Amino acid sequence: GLSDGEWQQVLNVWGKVEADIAGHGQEVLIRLFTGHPETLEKFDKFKHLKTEAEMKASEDLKKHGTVVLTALGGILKKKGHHEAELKPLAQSHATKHKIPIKYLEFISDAIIHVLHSKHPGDFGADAQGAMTKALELFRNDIAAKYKELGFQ
Numbered sequence: 001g002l003s004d005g006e007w008q009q010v011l012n013v014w015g016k017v018e019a020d021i022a023g024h025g026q027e028v029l030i031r032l033f034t035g036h037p038e039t040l041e042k043f044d045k046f047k048h049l050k051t052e053a054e055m056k057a058s059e060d061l062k063k064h065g066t067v068v069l070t071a072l073g074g075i076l077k078k079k080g081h082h083e084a085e086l087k088p089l090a091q092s093h094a095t096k097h098k099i100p101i102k103y104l105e106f107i108s109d110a111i112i113h114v115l116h117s118k119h120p121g122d123f124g125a126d127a128q129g130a131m132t133k134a135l136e137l138f139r140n141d142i143a144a145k146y147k148e149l150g151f152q
């Protein structure tokens with residue numbers, strides 16, 4: 001688990017994200033897709049985006065970033081008590097979207113990069129550690145559901 005002080009750091013920086021969830025969402029997915037191009041292949045609706053300029057010009061990419069981070073926000077605010085969210089999210093990501101755990105790691109790393117890039121004053125090393133733990137917790141619980149399913 002995280003401590004109370006770690007949860008508070010996580011949700012304090014998350015409050016900054018919420019000022020422009022859509023801009024954050026866009027930068028997170030651009031960082032993901034450019035850093036790890038295999039991840040883009042999982043999204044039929046984004047495979048036509050070749051260049052970073054195309055990704056940045058895509059309103060649908062921006063929309064999807066908003067949807068992803070808003071879902072992630074909901075999870076974070078449960079402070080680990082996220083069984084109701086995490087069961088169906090694991091089931092869709094394992095079964096419908098065929099998303100390896102490693103890609104969850106990649107997007108967590110993209111989030112940490114973007115939050116550090118935009119909020120260094122609320123995202124010093126300790127707060128970065130706490131966000132990395134919160135994202136590790138969610139990934140770790142999703143992994144158990146992947147294992148249950150035999151994916152793969």
Ligand SMILES: O=N[O-]
Binds near residue numbers: 068
């Ligand atoms: O669409 N999940 O990023």
Ligand SMILES: O=N[O-]
Binds near residue numbers: 118119120122
């Ligand atoms: O990031 N506020 O310095």
